Amino acid sequence: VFNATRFASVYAWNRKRISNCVADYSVLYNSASFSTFKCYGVSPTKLND
Amino acid sequence: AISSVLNDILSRLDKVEAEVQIDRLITGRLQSLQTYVTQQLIRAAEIR
Numbered sequence A: 001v002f003n004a005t006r007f008a009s010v011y012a013w014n015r016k017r018i019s020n021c022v023a024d025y026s027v028l029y030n031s032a033s034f035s036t037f038k039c040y041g042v043s044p045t046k047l048n049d
Numbered sequence B: 001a002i003s004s005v006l007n008d009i010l011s012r013l014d015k016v017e018a019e020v021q022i023d024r025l026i027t028g029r030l031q032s033l034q035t036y037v038t039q040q041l042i043r044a045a046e047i048r
């Protein structure tokens, strides 16, 4: 998801469905790479709960 | 607000975004008791 070789043009924006798996969002939040990580119906810590 | 269950706000939000949400419920609910208790004080004057 976050590491594909290429992304789509924003007119055709690709959508990948995520299901039947464990999510640990700390892996992304601890990643010093991301300029932006804003949450809009939850708080980014509470994702893990 | 996002949800009519308190703990489904509180598990999903931090100390500040929850203060913005929760006070909505504190308002609405308070106005629901402030209504109900008025309605009873007047009915009570009817039954009195």
Ligand SMILES: *[C@@H]1O[C@H](CO)[C@@H](O[C@@H]2O[C@H](CO)[C@@H](O[C@H]3O[C@H](CO)[C@@H](O)[C@H](O)[C@@H]3O)[C@H](O)[C@H]2NC(C)=O)[C@H](O)[C@H]1NC(C)=O
Binding pocket: A002, A003, A031, A033
């Ligand atoms: C894109 O894919 C990269 C490869 O999977 C990934 O980089 C890797 O990130 C992990 C941490 O999740 C690193 O793991 C090591 O971290 C420290 C390094 O000092 C070690 O002490 C640990 O024992 C552990 O082995 C990898 O070293 C790192 N590899 C590379 C080549 O960067 C990126 O995080 C991925 N990016 C995104 C956006 O998902």
